[PDB]
Design an enzyme around this catalytic site. Sequence first.
Site, PDB file in Angstrom:
ATOM      1  N   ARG A  38      -3.012 177.558  16.036  1.00 30.65           N
ATOM      2  CA  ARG A  38      -3.752 177.653  14.785  1.00 30.65           C
ATOM      3  C   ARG A  38      -3.502 178.895  13.956  1.00 30.65           C
ATOM      4  O   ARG A  38      -3.508 178.830  12.728  1.00 30.65           O
ATOM      5  CB  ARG A  38      -5.230 177.451  15.046  1.00 30.65           C
ATOM      6  CG  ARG A  38      -5.566 175.992  15.292  1.00 30.65           C
ATOM      7  CD  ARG A  38      -6.934 175.853  15.885  1.00 30.65           C
ATOM      8  NE  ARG A  38      -7.590 174.654  15.387  1.00 30.65           N
ATOM      9  CZ  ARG A  38      -8.575 174.024  16.015  1.00 30.65           C
ATOM     10  NH1 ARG A  38      -9.023 174.473  17.181  1.00 30.65           N
ATOM     11  NH2 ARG A  38      -9.133 172.956  15.459  1.00 30.65           N
ATOM     12  N   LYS A 213     -12.836 153.885  23.555  1.00 32.35           N
ATOM     13  CA  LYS A 213     -13.955 153.101  23.024  1.00 32.35           C
ATOM     14  C   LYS A 213     -13.802 152.559  21.611  1.00 32.35           C
ATOM     15  O   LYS A 213     -13.299 153.228  20.717  1.00 32.35           O
ATOM     16  CB  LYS A 213     -15.262 153.895  23.110  1.00 32.35           C
ATOM     17  CG  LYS A 213     -15.667 154.321  24.522  1.00 32.35           C
ATOM     18  CD  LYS A 213     -16.065 153.136  25.410  1.00 32.35           C
ATOM     19  CE  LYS A 213     -16.379 153.593  26.844  1.00 32.35           C
ATOM     20  NZ  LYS A 213     -16.901 152.498  27.722  1.00 32.35           N
ATOM     21  N   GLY A 371      -5.948 163.130  18.514  1.00 33.76           N
ATOM     22  CA  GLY A 371      -5.770 164.286  19.375  1.00 33.76           C
ATOM     23  C   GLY A 371      -4.625 164.040  20.338  1.00 33.76           C
ATOM     24  O   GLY A 371      -3.538 164.627  20.206  1.00 33.76           O
ATOM     25  N   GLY A 394     -12.037 165.810  13.360  1.00 34.92           N
ATOM     26  CA  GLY A 394     -13.180 165.089  12.831  1.00 34.92           C
ATOM     27  C   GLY A 394     -13.114 164.831  11.340  1.00 34.92           C
ATOM     28  O   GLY A 394     -13.660 163.846  10.837  1.00 34.92           O
TER      29      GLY A 394
END
Length: 415
Positions: A38, A213, A371, A394
């Site tokens: 980052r 999921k 991810g 997100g």
Amino acid sequence: SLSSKLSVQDLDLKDKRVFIRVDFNVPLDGKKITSNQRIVAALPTIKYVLEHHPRYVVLASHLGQPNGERNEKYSLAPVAKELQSLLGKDVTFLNDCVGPEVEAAVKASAPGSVILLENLRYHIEEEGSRKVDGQKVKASKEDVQKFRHELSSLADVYINDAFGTAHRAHSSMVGFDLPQRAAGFLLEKELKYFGKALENPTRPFLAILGGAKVADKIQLIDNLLDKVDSIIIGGGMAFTFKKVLENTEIGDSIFDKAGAEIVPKLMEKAKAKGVEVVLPVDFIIADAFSADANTKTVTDKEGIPAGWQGLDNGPESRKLFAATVAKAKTIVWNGPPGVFEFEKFAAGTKALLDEVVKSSAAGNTVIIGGGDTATVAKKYGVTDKISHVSTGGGASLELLEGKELPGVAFLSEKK
């Protein structure tokens, strides 16, 4: 339009007081950066600005979850040192983001200075709230405005380079009332790609979805159904769609009980829009969730025996997915087709990865936004082959599921 916003590249930076909200949320272990990815990613913006001789450059960010309380465990001090090394220029580190001390220090700086302020989240007013005894202790509107007032004091121009936080209306994303709130090279890149994909997509627009999921991606499919031409549903996600639409016998595979309720609905819509839904026709089953488990191929019709569970895409499905990919002009992929962590169950993921890359080679827009889906690209060293591997996390999801991003809305238009 995600694409109409102002870029760093349009700003007149000379002798200006530039403020850059960056994503220096790196993993620390005993107060040491396990991954400087980052910090490295943020350099271009920082360097481009510095070349225009600003009066100074103030960098701000958050790290971990301090919870609006000064907690040494999440101090940006180490980060300050890594950046100085990586940047090849001195970085002044201040113990706070607001206050007279900051004002003073900032004011006494030398031209071209690079100041990095302490963790924005040591203050409850950044997020605007705090958890105390499990409950959400909100901050007072006055204090929140005070903080934003003090923060803005430090700058003449504001640049946002933290896409990962753009989906939250935090003080650092939406509290800078300056005439020019611009986009950094990093966030501009995300805006350019997701912008096209969601605005003027070069059809056929395909979307590969996968993972564990279906419940977490219900809002994603729904929205995308108004967008895509065809959509592939693989991974542990497919087991819910198959047992429902095709009464497939799934073994001890992933079944999202709550997500099964919506499956008919999304399918009705898929049909309504004439979206081509491609699902796995065969899978590789395993008698246990382990790298050392007995496999066996089975199919749509044969089903999966009790005890057993499908952990990867079968041979026919790979042929099927390879075809679908090969027909698209725009691809947005999120989620691996199988448990790729284990070599025995890595075939589907690899097969798909190669196809996507080949599509990128063809000159098609391939957008990775997951991810583990990025980790896959990194592992097979093909990252440089994919048109865009998002870092939004997100924010990327929310963007894909329809939502409007505060941090993005707040930016100025190109002019």
